[PDB]
């Protein structure tokens, strides 16, 4: 279905973003690739900073310090900016420029 494909895509994007947060030219080319794949796809699911994707991500992740680090980074990115995908891609842009 379309919703299952969307959950698979957001799940794999979060898993690969977690793996990339733990080579900067290949990562910036990766984040440019996923952001162009976001425009062909584009809110209960993407509400603030990906709360509801937790069990989907840690079916395959199983290390909650990675999830807590991602949630803290997205929360401080939201606090610095002051839907959820754009906050992630601006957060992944700050990692890639370092």
């Amino acid at each position, epitope marked *: 279905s379309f919703y299952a494909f969307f959950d698979l895509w957001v799940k794999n994007l979060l898993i690969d973003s977690i793996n990339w947060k733990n080579n900067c030219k290949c990562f910036e080319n990766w984040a440019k690739t996923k952001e162009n794949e976001w425009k062909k796809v584009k809110y209960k699911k993407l509400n603030n900073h990906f709360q509801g994707y937790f*069990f989907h991500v840690m079916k395959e992740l199983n290390k909650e*310090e990675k999830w807590y680090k991602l949630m803290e980074d997205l929360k401080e990115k939201i606090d610095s900016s002051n839907g959820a995908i754009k906050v992630l891609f601006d957060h992944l842009k700050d990692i890639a420029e370092r």
Partner: antibody, heavy 119, light 110 residues
């Protein structure tokens, strides 16, 4: 394996209450925790969830903004800080343990029950 | 996902087999559990994948169902099997939901 709660308490509406759920016999850090609410003559109703660490915390739609689940995995205590209690929160509060596996979101072993009644 | 316990109150003699149901409004899968709220006691988990059996549960608690129709079959009803049985979906959708049923009830018929 045992989950011992704090016992019931009488609270005025609009007040606050801190439930407790002391676990024993297993590793508290390795298990996800839950809060399940049963009103008199209404049936079971999940209200809260917390993960192995505080990385994820989920609430029912009727309890968001009012209740807060917290855990202390070195003291083996699970709390539910209750705030702005209405008249529909007179219920029995159950402390449940989740099975290993984040997909299997079931309630394996339960607490003794805690009748919270508002007046 | 809306879960409907059609049997509700069930007048059945002890020592007999009792079948139940838990109809889901949406396609859930194998992500459904079953519970037993014995009177004067906490609930306990019986089945956690709509077919399996939890640890510490006798083999007479068996279930089936993988789509929208689910069924718990308890056999040889003892004194403690006359309880209220709940069914919970834990479907892997976003946001995650923990939805129970109304609670079917098994009672002694006379």
């Amino acid at each position: 394996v045992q989950l011992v709660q704090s016992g019931g308490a009488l609270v005025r509406p609009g007040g606050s209450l801190r439930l407790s759920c002391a676990a024993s016999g297993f590793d508290f850090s390795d298990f996800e925790m839950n809060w399940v609410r049963q009103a008199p003559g209404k049936g079971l109703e999940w209200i809260s969830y917390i993960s192995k660490i505080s990385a994820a915390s989920f609430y029912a739609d009727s309890v968001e903004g009012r209740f807060t689940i917290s855990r202390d995995n070195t003291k083996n205590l699970l709390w539910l800080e209750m705030t702005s209690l209405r008249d529909e929160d007179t219920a029995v509060y159950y402390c449940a343990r989740d099975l290993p596996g984040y997909l299997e979101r079931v309630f394996d072993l339960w607490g003794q029950g805690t009748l919270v009644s508002v007046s | 996902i809306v879960l409907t316990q059609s049997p509700a109150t069930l007048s059945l003699s002890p020592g007999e087999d009792a079948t139940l149901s838990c109809r889901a409004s949406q396609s859930v899968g194998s992500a459904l559990a079953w519970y037993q709220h014995r009177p004067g006691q906490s609930p306990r988990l019986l089945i956690y994948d709509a077919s399996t059996r939890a640890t510490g549960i006798p083999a007479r608690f068996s279930g089936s169902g993988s789509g929208t129709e689910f069924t718990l079959t308890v056999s040889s009803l003892t004194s403690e099997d006359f309880a209220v049985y709940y069914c919970q979906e834990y479907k892997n959708s976003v946001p995650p939901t923990w939805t129970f049923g109304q609670g079917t009830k098994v009672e002694i018929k006379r």
